[PDB]
Design a protein around this ligand. Structure first.
Ligand SMILES: Cc1cc2nc3c(=O)[nH]c(=O)nc-3n(C[C@H](O)[C@H](O)[C@H](O)COP(=O)(O)O)c2cc1C
Ligand SMILES: Cc1cc2nc3c(=O)[nH]c(=O)nc-3n(C[C@H](O)[C@H](O)[C@H](O)COP(=O)(O)O)c2cc1C
Lengths: 194, 192
């Protein structure tokens, strides 16, 4: 049924000025962030870049996926609550109230300073048996792909981010109410540069 | 037949924007019957996994523990090459047309003027047989793949990320170590 809270995001701003070649030139991991929340425009553009619908007729995405199974769900961990990005409606649906940035950090405390973390969770059951390692590998490739959309957008938009595999995956499974077929693969703390 | 192809300096002044590149990012499996220019090949490889910070030797693509495990091999009609990121050049590995090895059964691949093969040297993480290290290598390949896909979209090049390929034949042709696992490939060409 409907989530208890919904964040409708603005249309993505396709007129931003950062070129691909400059974004690749400046692409880098940054592990310190301003405490300030992302504006809604920056969050919207970030999530659309990550894994937004870019072809509304076909339902296809900014990120390719094996067999077009679109397995990578982007969970958005904010201080107020954790949300799932719904690409079809370009909106955030609340999953759990509370600040779960600690679960993402998994022992690296700088992660708790980012205003947002994106967790890239592959629903490996979209490929069939979530137990088969070739399915898990495709999920890992697919996650990598979404990760780099985030890193490239962040470079263009002058946002700090670092791709990460470390996290408390057991705690995230509980707090985000994941099924065991949904495997956290990577996360991206994101913020303005400090 | 030359052992090394020098690539021109990467052109950091190309025009296509990130947001427009994301908008037009798509898999294309048909290609003009045109070869890539040397400038486009140069820029494509630098985009994939070039050095962007010469002081640190760091790259356009992140990698787990900065191990830089993804090597990019370049399969052209004249020969198969390794991309040497340090010197921004192609080192010839095998003469002849090995695009059939990349195709692995999908014949459209043979019609692209170049294929990039993304090979993770999983020994850079330690034990090449450990599943956690193979997963990191798969993530890292996917990261490089998306650099390719986004560059292609910005540069009006057709590409498709692929996992299918004849990995046994590529191990032979490219003289891979047992630790170097072909992960993904990208046929690239101009649009029809
Ligand atoms: C798959 C993968 C996993 C990573 N995991 C972590 C991590 O858990 N924590 C962290 O601080 N950095 C992590 N990194 C970031 C790397 O350390 C970083 O990409 C590398 O040192 C190179 O620096 P650069 O991204 O600025 O080029 C990860 C990167 C990748 C690609
Ligand atoms: C990890 C991965 C593996 C893929 N392997 C193949 C492949 O072997 N052959 C193929 O034709 N396409 C392959 N694809 C491309 C997908 O079919 C394609 O991304 C998907 O159909 C969605 O189309 P789109 O990329 O235009 O959004 C692969 C994509 C990914 C991400």
């Amino acid at each position: 049924g409907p989530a208890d809270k919904v964040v409708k995001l603005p249309k993505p701003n396709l007129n931003r000025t950062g070129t691909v070649m400059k974004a690749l030139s400046e692409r880098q991991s940054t592990r310190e962030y301003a405490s300030k929340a992302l504006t809604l425009a920056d969050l919207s553009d970030l999530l659309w870049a990550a894994n937004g619908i870019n072809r509304s007729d076909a339902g296809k995405r900014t990120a390719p996926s094996a067999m077009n199974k679109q397995d990578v769900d982007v969970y958005v961990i904010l201080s107020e609550g954790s949300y799932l990005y719904d690409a079809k409606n370009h909106q955030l649906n609340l999953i759990a109230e509370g600040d779960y940035r600690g679960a993402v950090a998994g022992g690296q405390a700088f992660v708790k300073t980012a205003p947002v973390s994106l967790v890239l969770i592959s629903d490996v059951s979209r490929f069939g048996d979530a137990q088969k390692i070739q399915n898990q590998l495709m999920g890992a490739m697919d996650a990598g792909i979404v990760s780099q959309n985030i890193s490239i957008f962040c470079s263009a938009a002058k946002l700090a981010t670092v791709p990460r595999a470390s996290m408390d995956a057991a705690q995230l499974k509980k707090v985000l109410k994941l099924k065991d077929s949904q495997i956290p693969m990577m996360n991206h703390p994101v913020g303005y540069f400090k």
